[PDB]
From Swiss-Prot, chain A:
Name under which the protein is recorded: Tuberous sclerosis 1 protein homolog
Gene: tsc1
Entire protein: shown range: 1 to 431 of 899
Lineage, opening ranks: Eukaryota, Fungi, Dikarya, Ascomycota, Taphrinomycotina
Subcellular location: Cytoplasm
Quaternary structure (record): Interacts with tsc2.
Function: Together with tsc2, required for uptake of various amino acids from the environment and for proper conjugation. Involved in induction of gene expression of permeases and genes required for meiosis upon nitrogen starvation. May act as a GTPase-activating protein (GAP) for the small GTPase rhb1.
Swiss-Prot record, chain B:
Self-association and partners: Interacts with tsc2.
Entry superkingdom: Eukaryota
Gene designation: tsc1
Subcellular location, record wording: Cytoplasm
UniProt function note: Together with tsc2, required for uptake of various amino acids from the environment and for proper conjugation. Involved in induction of gene expression of permeases and genes required for meiosis upon nitrogen starvation. May act as a GTPase-activating protein (GAP) for the small GTPase rhb1.
Listed name of the protein: Tuberous sclerosis 1 protein homolog
Length: 391, 403
């Protein structure tokens, strides 16, 4: 009789957790791995008290969260069950959040138990992942739709929900960047999603956690470029660049394919006008452009990096990009002032030293000769020890 | 229109009477008549040179000057085989290098020839593997003369010195173009202890240029030897030659590092316990190495810039890259060595190693590896070298910035 005394204490405390906590620890000693028939039982017993006292007023909320927080490690869930947990706890909370920081810390405490886990085979089968999968998708989906929907009659109350959802999604991201980028992928294709998603994405990349290298696998990166190539809104595009810049050190491999794209992007951004703003694209694929009114990471950095790495082709692209475009089989979608290009670009170039590449490689060998990325192992290891010297 | 016959006259003229110009013009009319090499004609032509060499051989200087001047002009045309350079070696190259004509432009001409053999674009330029065969040969005899010549004890030195000087120059200039090759030729010789000092002598100089493509040297197995030399040999000079070589090549490996890591820790131990009176520690083991000591009875002149390559850098380079295991090793190395299943060969002074290596640690920032890995995850976990791709890019852009 160690279950039948914990359940006493549920009831006792869903009308100090001292007694509940105590009984949980003597439960975990007798059951260290999760027990499914005790999970089942206890799952049921909660369903029954939630009938008796629900999530309506805040003091019932505080309570329920403290409790769910301390008992959830003992349980085993699935897609069906988190649907219940979402429907009846997560959504209600987010949808109109209590103004107590602890109470939200607790909400997070529970969410992140489901989302982030060492062991995948912990609850049997795939279940631990499946739960996290759903939970992250519902969270994503709520934020996206909460970020667009016209807002009928509380504004401030709506800013409270995105303040919390962001904080949670960012937090998921720095730990799980392939996953959060996968969740954003269908949504990204729908214009008004874009400002919000990026707003969240840069905030993850700004931290430079691992393992951002994963992100391109998920096809998001590809999208983020399409946004920089085609979309219009100056606010959006500035997010898009800060993104593609900040991730560009954590690749060099996808660099081979996104090169010609990136050149064209440098072209677009260098050409940003006071009055006309950006040059609008023409081709656009089937991308369905974003315009502003439906009705300090500037291109300078992008230059440096393209002028390292691909200097010969870069300075051949600039000079005559329409030209460089045929011969490499692509199109310059944007109308653009050359002499202004040669001007700005040169100002920047004056600030750089001269490139050895010009002595070793041609423009043909610069694109094709992977022996060149030998020299990288060499100069990294040297620059690593120079970071560990204090003086 | 007759082509070859007029050139032989041109040739015969120019070896009895030092004006060339005529010959030069006869070579330019033939070359359009035969852009590729013609093996029926090389045949005839060497037949000719052979003839004229018994008539007017090498012997005095002035003859040499002329011989050289002329071979240089003609050698584009000819085709040699493994056996043919055995002529030129015995009849021309060897005569020269043993007692050399003290005339820079002469040696210049000689080198013109050699490196015309030694260095080339197309492997089938002569048919089959002949171009590369002569090459492989020449360098061999060069190497074998350089080694022989730098051990044979006694030609009033001043003669001998001019010999090795020339050879070195030539080997180094081969080295920097073809490191993979030259380090190949050096392995056997290197197993014989007195070749070491002279062989590292050349190799460190090649490495120092940091020309391409030093990564190729490990494949030869020469990297592994040099390490052996550092683990076992006694000779202060040879040793520092050794450490120099390995420090300046480590930056082009980071792959064999996963195979050399413990070796290197043992080396770091050993080079760090260097003593005024007892010098290096003695290698208890050796295996089948064949130790070299200084007085193997009972060059020299070690390059002054290679001095700054002391164990301090080995420390700095093992503190980055393998911070955890390195520091572990330097706490109880015997202990670390069981468990990682190798052996400490040296007697050493613990407290000294901790007094001294502390001194060096203190110069260094705290390592992040301590927050992200354990000792075993540090050793195995190939994702750690992903971060390196990103820091490499940022390291690059800030050198190309003029301020």
């Amino acid at each position: 009789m160690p279950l039948q005394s914990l359940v006493k204490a549920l009831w006792n405390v869903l009308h100090d957790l001292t007694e509940l906590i105590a009984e949980v620890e003597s439960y975990q000693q007798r059951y260290p791995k999760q027990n499914p028939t005790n999970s089942q039982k206890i799952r049921h017993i909660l369903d029954e008290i939630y009938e008796k006292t629900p999530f309506n007023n805040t003091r019932r909320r505080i309570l329920w969260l403290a409790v769910l927080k301390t008992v959830i490690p003992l349980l085993i869930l699935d897609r069906q069950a988190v649907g219940e947990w979402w429907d009846q706890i997560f959504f209600p909370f987010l949808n109109s959040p209590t103004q107590l920081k602890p109470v939200f810390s607790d909400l997070k405490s529970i969410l992140f138990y489901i989302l982030i886990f060492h062991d995948e085979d912990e609850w049997g089968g795939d279940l631990r992942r499946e739960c996290a999968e759903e939970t992250i998708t519902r969270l994503v989906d709520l934020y996206v739709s909460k970020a667009i929907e016209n807002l009928g009659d509380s504004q401030e109350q709506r800013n409270q929900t995105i303040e919390c959802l962001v904080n949670v999604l960012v937090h998921y991201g720095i730990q799980r960047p392939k996953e959060l980028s996968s969740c954003f992928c269908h949504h990204f294709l729908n214009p008004p999603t874009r400002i919000p998603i990026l707003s969240v994405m840069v905030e993850v990349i700004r931290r430079q956690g691992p393992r951002l290298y994963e992100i391109p696998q998920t096809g998001f990166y590809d999208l983020v470029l399409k946004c920089a190539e085609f979309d219009t809104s100056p606010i959006l595009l500035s997010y898009a660049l800060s993104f593609i810049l900040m991730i560009l050190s954590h690749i060099c491999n996808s660099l081979d394919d996104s090169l010609y794209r990136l050149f064209c992007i440098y072209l677009r951004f260098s050409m940003i006008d006071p009055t006309s703003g950006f040059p609008s694209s023409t081709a656009s694929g089937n991308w369905e452009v974003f315009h502003d009114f439906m009705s300090s990471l500037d291109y300078s950095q992008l230059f440096s990096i393209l002028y390292a790495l691909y200097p010969i082709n870069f300075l051949e692209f600039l000079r005559d990009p329409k030209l460089y475009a045929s011969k490499h089989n692509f199109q310059i979608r944007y109308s653009f002032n050359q002499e202004l290009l040669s001007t700005k670009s040169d100002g920047l170039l004056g600030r750089h030293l001269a490139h050895s590449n010009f002595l070793k490689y041609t423009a043909e060998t610069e694109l094709t000769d992977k022996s060149r990325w030998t020299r990288l192992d060499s100069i990294a290891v040297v620059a690593l020890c120079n970071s560990l010297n204090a003086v």
